[PDB]
Design an enzyme around this catalytic site. Structure first.
Site, PDB file in Angstrom:
ATOM      1  N   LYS A  76       0.808  -1.202   0.000  1.00 52.58           N
ATOM      2  CA  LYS A  76       0.000   0.000   0.000  1.00 52.58           C
ATOM      3  C   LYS A  76       0.862   1.282   0.000  1.00 52.58           C
ATOM      4  CE  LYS A  76      -3.683  -1.826  -0.976  1.00 52.58           C
ATOM      5  NZ  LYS A  76      -4.757  -1.405  -1.989  1.00 52.58           N
ATOM      6  N   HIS A  95      -2.238   4.077  -5.954  1.00 49.09           N
ATOM      7  CA  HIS A  95      -3.528   4.797  -5.997  1.00 49.09           C
ATOM      8  C   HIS A  95      -3.308   6.276  -6.314  1.00 49.09           C
ATOM      9  CE1 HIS A  95      -5.206   1.126  -4.486  1.00 49.09           C
ATOM     10  NE2 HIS A  95      -4.533   1.203  -3.351  1.00 49.09           N
ATOM     11  N   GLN A 100      -7.050  10.654  -7.801  1.00 46.95           N
ATOM     12  CA  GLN A 100      -7.161  10.700  -6.329  1.00 46.95           C
ATOM     13  C   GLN A 100      -6.585  12.038  -5.762  1.00 46.95           C
ATOM     14  OE1 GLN A 100      -5.687   8.025  -8.059  1.00 46.95           O
ATOM     15  NE2 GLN A 100      -6.438   6.057  -7.228  1.00 46.95           N
ATOM     16  N   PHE A 134      -7.132  -9.058  -5.335  1.00 43.08           N
ATOM     17  CA  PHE A 134      -7.692  -9.671  -4.086  1.00 43.08           C
ATOM     18  C   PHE A 134      -9.176 -10.238  -4.114  1.00 43.08           C
ATOM     19  CE2 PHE A 134      -4.153  -9.026  -1.272  1.00 43.08           C
ATOM     20  CZ  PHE A 134      -3.521  -7.800  -1.709  1.00 43.08           C
ATOM     21  N   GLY A 202     -16.708 -15.196 -11.151  1.00 45.32           N
ATOM     22  CA  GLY A 202     -15.427 -14.548 -10.828  1.00 45.32           C
ATOM     23  C   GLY A 202     -14.789 -15.070  -9.559  1.00 45.32           C
ATOM     24  N   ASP A 226     -24.834 -15.317 -12.734  1.00 43.34           N
ATOM     25  CA  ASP A 226     -23.859 -14.448 -13.346  1.00 43.34           C
ATOM     26  C   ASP A 226     -24.504 -13.612 -14.455  1.00 43.34           C
ATOM     27  OD1 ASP A 226     -21.289 -13.633 -14.896  1.00 43.34           O
ATOM     28  OD2 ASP A 226     -20.604 -14.411 -12.897  1.00 43.34           O
ATOM     29  N   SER A 278     -18.772  -5.620  -4.183  1.00 42.43           N
ATOM     30  CA  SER A 278     -18.327  -4.553  -5.083  1.00 42.43           C
ATOM     31  C   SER A 278     -18.622  -3.148  -4.594  1.00 42.43           C
ATOM     32  CB  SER A 278     -19.069  -4.701  -6.412  1.00 42.43           C
ATOM     33  OG  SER A 278     -18.837  -5.989  -6.884  1.00 42.43           O
ATOM     34  N   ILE A 317     -18.417  -3.013   3.326  1.00 43.47           N
ATOM     35  CA  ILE A 317     -16.992  -2.853   3.585  1.00 43.47           C
ATOM     36  C   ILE A 317     -16.173  -2.935   2.250  1.00 43.47           C
ATOM     37  CG2 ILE A 317     -14.893  -4.038   4.650  1.00 43.47           C
ATOM     38  CD1 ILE A 317     -17.311  -4.973   6.840  1.00 43.47           C
TER      39      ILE A 317
END
Length: 372
Positions: A76, A95, A100, A134, A202, A226, A278, A317
């Site tokens: 990160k 990022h 951003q 991830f 997925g 799906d 998502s 989350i």
């Protein structure tokens, strides 16, 4: 031609994942890599595992004075409060490629130092598929929490919410906790829940399914949807009729929503828990337009304010992998490993060249008087 990698200790608060694990360090050393690993008390891994895997153990923050040829790898971002020049080649999620807040300043550090950023988020194979992401444990953790909230609703009154959650040391420990909650819910007479998953094919989808099987949810109770099914266009009747709905598909175009307050406002609704794997608060076209809050580990659910039917909550989350930081690391680092093996050829290997050229393009956008 031999590569030296330095695994930087994460400084992002509560970041317990790592880009290289003791297992992948060990494989890389077998391949002739030299590996330094910073001591990280926030890491879910014990330093001693990296020691046994052959890493050279160094203090947190030591990368800042490491020889210029070391490739500094982390997961990160850097502290925004650090403003010193970045001299190394870095591998990390930075990022800063998506406008951003502060993105130019991020890049200005590399520019001033003559450093290079190979962004993890944009390492792709030759067909353009991301080599390492991830998904799986996002879906695993999301499902785990939806079962916990569904079960919570069977054993507590509506005026209580699912308590604060915390990262787990391994998958077994999570499964055992979910299973305990779940068996307690069933002891009250609740029937076994039916679960609708959108995006079942997925990696997040497969993660969610894997969790449900391991907890003991019958395969018959899982509706695996799906694109074939969602292209029919929403709202979907099957959503209020499920006990738990897990969404794993990111949609941000102006289409008909999967569900809405109108379909939810209904005394025959069985749906108790929505896990939007998502979830993205900045989505202009949220296909599950029933929540505005991105929930967090200290406060993992938010009420959907319905006018009819049982109490209904959302889990939104956006760092679900962090519930299982060890397994999430292992899978990410395994998937990243074939690309790391190409680092001795990073000047020519397209996977690394794509990432470098992209860095240079985003760098060219930065217009600053200090560069004249």
């Amino acid at each position: 031609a031999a590569v030296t990698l330095h695994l930087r200790a994460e400084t992002k608060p509560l970041e317990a994942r790592a880009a290289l694990t003791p297992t992948t360090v060990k494989k890389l050393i077998a391949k002739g890599f030299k590996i330094y690993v910073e001591d990280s008390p926030q890491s879910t891994f014990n330093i001693n595992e990296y020691r046994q895997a052959g890493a050279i153990i160094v203090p947190a923050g030591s990368w800042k004075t490491a020889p210029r040829d070391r490739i500094i790898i982390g997961l990160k971002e850097m502290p925004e409060t650090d403003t010193f020049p970045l001299v190394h080649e870095h591998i990390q999620f930075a990022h800063c490629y998506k406008d951003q807040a502060g993105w130019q300043n991020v890049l200005m550090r590399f520019i001033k130092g003559h450093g290079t950023l190979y962004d993890l988020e944009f390492l792709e194979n030759d067909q353009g598929r991301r080599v390492a992401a991830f998904g799986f444990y996002a879906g695993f953790a999301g499902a785990a929490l939806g079962v916990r909230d569904w079960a919570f609703k069977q054993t507590h009154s509506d005026d209580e919410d699912l308590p604060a959650v915390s990262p787990y040391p391994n998958e077994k420990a999570l499964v055992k906790d979910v299973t305990k909650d779940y068996k307690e819910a069933l002891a009250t007479g609740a029937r076994k829940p039916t679960v609708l998953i959108i995006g079942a094919l997925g990696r997040s989808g497969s993660g969610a399914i894997d969790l449900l099987h391991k907890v003991g949810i019958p395969d018959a109770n899982i509706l695996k949807w799906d694109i074939k099914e969602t292209s029919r266009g929403g709202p979907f009747d099957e959503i209020p009729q499920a006990d738990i709905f897990i969404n794993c598909i990111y949609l941000s175009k102006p289409i008909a929503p999967f569900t809405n307050m109108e379909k939810l406002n209904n005394p025959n609704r069985r749906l108790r828990t929505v896990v939007d794997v998502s979830a993205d608060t900045t989505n202009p076209h949220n296909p599950i337009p029933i929540y505005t809050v991105a929930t967090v580990f200290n406060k993992p659910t938010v009420l959907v304010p319905t006018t009819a039917g049982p109490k209904l909550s959302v889990i939104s989350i956006d760092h679900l992998p962090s519930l299982l930081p060890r397994e999430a690391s292992e899978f990410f680092s395994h998937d990243l490993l074939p690309s790391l093996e190409l680092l001795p050829q990073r000047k020519t290997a397209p996977v690394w060249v794509r990432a470098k050229k992209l860095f240079d393009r985003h760098c060219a956008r930065v217009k600053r008087s200090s560069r004249l």
